Design a protein around this ligand. Structure first.
Ligand SMILES: Cn1c(-c2ccccc2)c([C@H]2CC[C@@H](C(=O)O)CC2)c2ccccc21
Length: 134
């Protein structure tokens, strides 16, 4: 269906701003924050029919999620939270909401020029992570 054509590919992290503070707000502990904050992951996005797969590969952790838009799934996050996740496409932005322990955080993925921009928001704390094509 050409769903998510502009997101598909292999992307590498180039910059990460306010990410330690975002992780602190989420509740991530000191040692995980330091090591995860140092990671320079490769994000690999693929689509096969209705199923979207997002992989993240780095020295910190290798993760993989597969999902259908709008259809909740149970995720173990890279920081070891057990969350209920829903990913939707809203006006061309991939919107990932994670719910756990009466808390919520939203991770948005946007295509801007030749970049993929990731915005993570927890209450009033935002972090921006910019990816380029690998
Ligand atoms: C540890 N860590 C990572 C992370 C950090 C490094 C490697 C893997 C996961 C993320 C996300 C992963 C999705 C997205 C991204 O892929 O950049 C934005 C950050 C994240 C979000 C909340 C808390 C801790 C978190």
């Amino acid at each position: 269906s050409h769903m998510c054509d502009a997101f598909v590919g292999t992307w590498k992290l180039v910059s990460s701003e306010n990410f330690d503070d975002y992780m602190k707000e989420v509740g991530v502990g000191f040692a995980t924050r330091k090591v995860a904050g140092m990671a320079k992951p490769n994000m690999i996005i693929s689509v096969n029919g209705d199923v979207i797969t997002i992989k993240s590969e780095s020295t910190f952790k290798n993760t993989e999620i597969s999902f259908i838009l709008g259809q909740e799934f149970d995720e173990v996050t890279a920081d070891d939270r057990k969350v209920k996740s829903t990913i939707t496409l809203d006006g061309g932005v991939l919107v990932h909401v994670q719910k756990w322990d009466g808390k919520s955080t939203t991770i948005k993925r946007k295509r801007e020029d030749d970049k993929l921009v990731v915005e993570c928001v927890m209450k009033g704390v935002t972090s921006t992570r910019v990816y380029e094509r690998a």
